[PDB]
Design a protein around this nucleic acid. Sequence first.
RNA 1: UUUUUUUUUUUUUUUUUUUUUUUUUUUUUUUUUUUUUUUUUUUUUUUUUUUUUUUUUUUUUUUUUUUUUUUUUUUUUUUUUUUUUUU
Length: 489
Amino acid sequence: TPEEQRAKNAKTILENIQIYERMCDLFGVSEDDKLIIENSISIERMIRVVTDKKYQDKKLKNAGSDPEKIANAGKVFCRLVESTAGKCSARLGMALKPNVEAVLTDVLGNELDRAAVLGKRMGFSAMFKSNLEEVLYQRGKNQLKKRNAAETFTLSQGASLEARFRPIMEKHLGVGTVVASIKNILASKKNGNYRNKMVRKPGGNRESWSPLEREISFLNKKLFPGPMRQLCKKFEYLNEQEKQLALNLMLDASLILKPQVTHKMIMPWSMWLAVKKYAEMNKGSPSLEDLAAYSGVRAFMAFNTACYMSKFTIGKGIVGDAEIMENGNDKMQTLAMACFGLAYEDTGIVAAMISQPMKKRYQLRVGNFNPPEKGTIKGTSAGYFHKWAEFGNRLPFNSFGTGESKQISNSGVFAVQRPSTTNIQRLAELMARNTGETSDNFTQLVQKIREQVGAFADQKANLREFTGGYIYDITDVTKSNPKIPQLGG
RNA sequence: UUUUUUUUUUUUUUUUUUUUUUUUUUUUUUUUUUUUUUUUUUUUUUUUUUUUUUUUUUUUUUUUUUUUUUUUUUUUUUUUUUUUUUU
């Protein structure tokens, strides 16, 4: 089956490629300029705007009698990079919404109303944009609405998304994204700035239910087994302030605790195009199905492949303010961060894989990715993840558990006078948990969080990776060369 | 001490809590501003005083206790009339 999954993935990407090629020709993009990651972003952006069904309802509500509003409902704009003589600039490409719909309906089928097929791939793109926004600008103008601070922001990977995508992206969003959503849903229940809703998810659960259930379900799919998932089960029976308080403490606990939260890679569509043209310029050996997965070393193959000759803008100006500034390899880091979701990964790990030193925001420099008045083109530094690694989704051992099967209330076939490993107390706990015990949960789990943090603050002594874990060479997807990132100071 | 059935799968993967590979919604806004903790641009109360005084630290104009002595002595420093040790 996984080979056929790589094939369906390869077709999915080939569709995105065919759309993008058509989009590039549609706005008049020069052949070399098609490679541009900024152009990837611009097309992907335009597709979000067109596909924003909610905002289209609202647009209609204010579209009024004005013939200028009505004509601009037919036009679609795309700010794109165009180059000449090694210099580069923006152009305002324009095509009608039916032109964009034609390409989309042609490649994905007339039933774009299969919200699953278009929304899956567009969720992944919107997530990549959300990633890049998150590394860029700490979401300030959105958090002035979404009302929460920097630590909450760190756990809120993917929370730059338009609301419609948040259901689609369930697995990969950082726990804070869900938490912030719930906290803001309680504000919406005061403010009326919202419409409440009901949904269903085939292949997962045919349950037919609201944001309340949906969020709690996603929260259960994320939280740590035992106490935190038990708080997740309690959650419908917390009062609203108890929900906010619980959310806060769980969010804080999630700053340490790393239960199942899903990584993903999303390279830009122009990098997928770059992979196609690379395969072409390699004369019939690099095969996209070999790269066609949301997981595993195939992702590092694809990124380092893009690291041969892919192209992007350099503005002389900065996403910065002081006189200290730094090079395109920092853009290359930013791209990597956005592509693999590295924003809360270990910089030391990354420093060894990228095989160059890593950084914090006080040090990070980049451009805006938005097509320029004037600037210059640049191409990729070779092989950049000169070491790779195996991906993953949870803590090494989470927390200390019970005996695995022994030390329970002993059985006795043989008629012999005996001691016993008497354990009726934890047996009665297992009965209490499976019967759904409900008295003293909030505080109980608050305390359990307090002491679990302490236990973890011991467990750190070995709580570090899946036990084969090292930064192997690109000559060593074979995991032959186990080596550590750093000793310390 | 006793007596029969058969339509969800096999000739491998670690020290491990849950479907590990699969399947759809939509009425609070976008095509810029810095090295930054909170709505940065908006919306009502009322019973201790007025139409002057200096270069200035506190109520500047107000409100109660009682067991060691009286109806004299000099130009003046301390109990001026009193109370136990011995190689």
